[PDB]
Design a binder for this molecule. Structure first.
Ligand SMILES: Nc1ncnc2c1ncn2[C@@H]1O[C@H](COP(=O)(O)OP(=O)(O)O)[C@@H](O)[C@H]1O
Length: 249
């Protein structure tokens, strides 16, 4: 019953919401459109240990320098969180263009952005829409406490649910859940310019400050984590309290 439109996917591109919410979200640079030689390199399906032209490499490392020397890369929608297995350090942290490119090339999520981004859109048959372009996003890296990140579900512009984003129990959350809820609620009021009524936003809350991390479609390809999409779909938006789930001890 839940359907996904082309516009819903387009509205969640990093460039589309970073613009809206620059004051709420960690610093980032966007290279758009993505350099063609970079795009060409990212489609390689090699497993063993071509390369973009120097101009692209310098452009990327200019952005890295400007962000303080360490970044997390992504394309329009997906962060290559799945591709930690290929990094020499086990981290999303990239300090050179080589590291950025290796991480992006090895991600299933990134590959999904590149080849299948609009395949679930009922109003778009398949290939990409007019006036669309891929973009290379370099987010400033910062160490973040995995257990104070949340995924927050919005339906008819109301917060119906949110959950802990990682999978480790963290007792501090239980004692402080009303504080987290208020900060998430307050952030959602500041997302008033987001154009769709239903969506999913990720937040990092640190020292009483909420940071917007990502916005994704209200659709089962967005991991529901501690919620199932069956319950998210049926959940009533008129409730005055959101459902809150944390990892059990
Ligand atoms: N700027 C950053 N610095 C450090 N870690 C990050 C940064 N951005 C994202 N991460 C880590 O990568 C994971 C994926 O982040 P996100 O950008 O929300 O991608 P997605 O929404 O595709 O999961 C997050 O859970 C976070 O732990």
């Amino acid at each position: 019953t839940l359907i996904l439109t082309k516009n819903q996917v387009l509205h969640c591109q990093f460039s589309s919401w970073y613009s809206l919410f620059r004051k709420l979200t960690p610093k980032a640079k966007v290279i758009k459109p993505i350099p063609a030689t970079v795009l060409k390199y990212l489609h390689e399906d090699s497993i063993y240990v071509y390369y973009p032209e120097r101009e692209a490499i310098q452009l990327i490392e200019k952005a890295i320098k400007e962000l303080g020397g360490a970044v997390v890369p992504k394309l329009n929608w997906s962060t290559p969180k799945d591709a930690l297995w290929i990094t020499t350090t086990g981290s999303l942290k990239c300090t050179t263009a080589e590291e950025v490119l290796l991480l992006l090339k090895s991600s299933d999520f990134v590959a999904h952005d590149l080849n299948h981004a609009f395949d679930d859109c009922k109003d778009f048959d398949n290939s990409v829409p007019k006036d669309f372009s891929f973009e290379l996003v370099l987010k400033e890296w910062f160490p973040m406490h995995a257990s104070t990140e949340f995924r927050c579900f919005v339906k008819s512009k109301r917060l119906i649910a949110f959950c802990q984003r990682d999978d480790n129990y963290y007792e501090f959350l239980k004692e402080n859940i009303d504080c987290y809820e208020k900060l998430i609620s307050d952030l959602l009021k500041k997302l008033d310019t987001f154009p769709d009524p239903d969506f999913v936003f990720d937040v990092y809350i640190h020292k009483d400050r909420a940071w917007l991390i990502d916005i994704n479609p209200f659709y089962p390809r967005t991991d529901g984590l501690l919620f199932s999409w069956s319950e998210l779909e049926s959940m009533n938006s008129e409730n005055m309290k959101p459902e809150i789930r944390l990892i059990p001890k």
